[PDB]
Amino acid sequence: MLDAFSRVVVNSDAKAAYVGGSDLQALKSFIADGNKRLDAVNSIVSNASCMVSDAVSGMICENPGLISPGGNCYTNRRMAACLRDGEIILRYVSYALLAGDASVLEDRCLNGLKETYIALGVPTNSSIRAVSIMKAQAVAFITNTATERKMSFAAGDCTSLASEVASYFDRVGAAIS
């Protein structure tokens, strides 16, 4: 199943897979504290469309040179491509939260990101500022400390997964440092 989930990612083509409820309880037994961890991914990706639309909007309000003419978020071809890199960080850290490892995050996403941002003129000091908002956004969502959208939850503690995603977000930022 997780090797079948590995067959979703690495195939270099669009693929999809689900897990039925007979196969689901084997996955909750194989991973530890998995009812938190399946709630951990579902807290993020249900609010992922506002998470990248506020973090890269918060990158602009701290650095307004990207909406200068000639700046790298000036046209809407580039502005939609900045959110397209914003979401594709956020899915690949969510599956890394879901599988519990970081090896799919390095090999499928971050191998070759420094070699493609310098070749494209992407400001690496500004995109580290964009992903650190997404580090700060996700720790509010994982501890239910968002001020606008608070979600219902089976109560308890999930601060171990709060430190797990902050070990995933800085691995993005160390890859583009």
Amino acid of residue 141: F
Binding positions for its own copies, 118-137, rule CB under 8 A: 124-126, 128-129, 131-132, 136
Residue 144, by phi and psi: left (phi above 0), alpha (psi -120 to 50) or beta? Answer: left
Residue 30 tokens, joined? 């194989």
Size of the site for ligand PEB (CB under 6 A): 61
| Residue choice 65, 101, 107, 112 for contact with its own copies (CB under 8 A) | 65
| Residue choice 14, 16, 70, 115 for contact with ligand PEB (CB under 6 A) | 70
SS3 string, 69-111, reads: CCCCCCCHHHHHHHHHHHHHHHHHHHHHHHHCCCHHHHHHHHC
x-or-dash string of contact with ligand PEB, 96-135, rule CB under 6 A: -------------x---x--x---x-xx--xx--x-xx--
149, 105 contact by CB (below 8 A): no
Quote the Cα angle for 142-146-152, to 5°: 65
Rounded least distance, CB 112 to its own copies, Å: 15
Q: Is 50 flagged in the annotation as binding?
A: yes
Q: Which does 29 bind (CB under 5 to 8 A by kind): its own copies, another protein, ligand PEB, none?
A: none
| Crossing angle of helices 34-45 and 48-62, rounded to 10° | 60
Q: Is 73 flagged in the annotation as binding?
A: no
Q: Is 61 flagged in the annotation as binding?
A: yes
List, in order, residues 6 or more apart from 21 with CB less than 8 Å away. Answer: none
x-or-dash string of contact with ligand PEB, 142-171, rule CB under 6 A: xxxxxxxx---xxxx-x--x----------
Q: Is 82 flagged in the annotation as binding?
A: yes
Binding positions for ligand PEB, 16-55, rule CB under 6 A: 24, 33, 35-36, 38-40, 42, 46-47, 50-51, 54
